[PDB]
Amino acid sequence: VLSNGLGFVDTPYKAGTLEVDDTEDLIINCDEVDCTTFVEYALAMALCPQQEMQEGDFARNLQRIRYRDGKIDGYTSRLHYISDWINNAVRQGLLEDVTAAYSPFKQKLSLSYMSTHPELYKSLKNSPENVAQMAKYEKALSGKEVHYLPKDKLEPDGLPWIKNGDIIALTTNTPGLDVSHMGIAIYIKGQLHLLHASSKEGKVVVGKTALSQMLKDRKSLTGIRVLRM
Numbered sequence: 001v002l003s004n005g006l007g008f009v010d011t012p013y014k015a016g017t018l019e020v021d022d023t024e025d026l027i028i029n030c031d032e033v034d035c036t037t038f039v040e041y042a043l044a045m046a047l048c049p050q051q052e053m054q055e056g057d058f059a060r061n062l063q064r065i066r067y068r069d070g071k072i073d074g075y076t077s078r079l080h081y082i083s084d085w086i087n088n089a090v091r092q093g094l095l096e097d098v099t100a101a102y103s104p105f106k107q108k109l110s111l112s113y114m115s116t117h118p119e120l121y122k123s124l125k126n127s128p129e130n131v132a133q134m135a136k137y138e139k140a141l142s143g144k145e146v147h148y149l150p151k152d153k154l155e156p157d158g159l160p161w162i163k164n165g166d167i168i169a170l171t172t173n174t175p176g177l178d179v180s181h182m183g184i185a186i187y188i189k190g191q192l193h194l195l196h197a198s199s200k201e202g203k204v205v206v207g208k209t210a211l212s213q214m215l216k217d218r219k220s221l222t223g224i225r226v227l228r229m
Contacts, residue, residue: 001046001229002165005184005195008038008204013197019122024075026063036082038197038204039167039182040065046165046229047094065089075123076133081111082169082179083141086227095167098226100147102161107148107222111138113176146178150223151215158185158192158211162226168194169225170215180221183207 014032021027030041044061045053064070067077068088079085089095115135118124124131148171162168162185172180183196191210198205207214215221 001042002184002186002195003051004045005038005042005165006186008033008042008197009195009206011038011197011204013199013202013204015199016122018078024078024123025072026059026066028059028062033197033204034199035181035183035197036085039184042184043089043094043167043229064092065094074130075127076130076137080114080134081137081141081177082182083109083111083146084137086146086169086179086225087141089227095227095229097147098161098166098228099149099224102226103147103149103153105148105150105153105223106145107171107178109141109144109146109178111142111176111178114138116176146225148223148225151212151221154192154212154215154224156191156210156212158187162192163228165229167227167229168211169227170221171223171225172220173222174220179225185211185226 012032015034017029017032018027044058047061048057079088090097115131115138118131164187166185168183168185169179170181183194186193186195194207194211
């Protein structure tokens with residue numbers, strides 16, 4: 001949610017915060033975030049019945065969002081592809097797929113980046129078993145359709161059905177990937193902007209440029225998916 005997300009403004013960006021330990025277990029690092037862990041922390045906080053927030057509730061929620069079916073079982077149990085992450089959260093009723101309700105446009109998933117470049121990942125580069133597992137997950141998701149909103153349908157002032165606090169996943173046509181970035185919707189000066197962890201700015205920011213312009217500026221971006229707590 002927006003109020004929880006906004007508490008992270010200016011928190012430094014750092015990639016790989018979840019890869020620091022030898023075995024996979026729950027890591028809570030709210031001091032350094034990437035585009036995904038930022039949203040996970042924000043969501044896990046927002047789901048808590050108290051805001052008085054109990055660390056047990058936050059920790060339970062985070063485990064449920066970060067891991068396939070909330071089960072911690074090695075590196076490949078963590079939800080690395082955002083399509084998979086979204087499916088996990090939607091199937092548990094934690095998020096509703098707003099673009100599924102509103103948009104008639106669809107993309108077919110084609111996931112393969114991780115198993116194609118296992119050298120890039122600490123937990124794949126020396127683990128043929130982990131690579132094989134990620135390839136099974138890629139295969140099971142590839143060919144499935146999701147709803148999205150094409151970027152040519154999004155204006156600087158957003159749309160009535162995209163609200164403050166919605167999670168926005170930026171869809172991509174780059175080989176082997178589904179979604180390149182996520183953030184939280186925030187209307188600023190009547191324009192739909194993105195609250196997100198930016199590697200460009202090196203920290204969590206409310207983006208200066210309207211979301212529609214962020215999308216239209218990049219040839220590899222195709223549109224968005226909109227999810228809501």
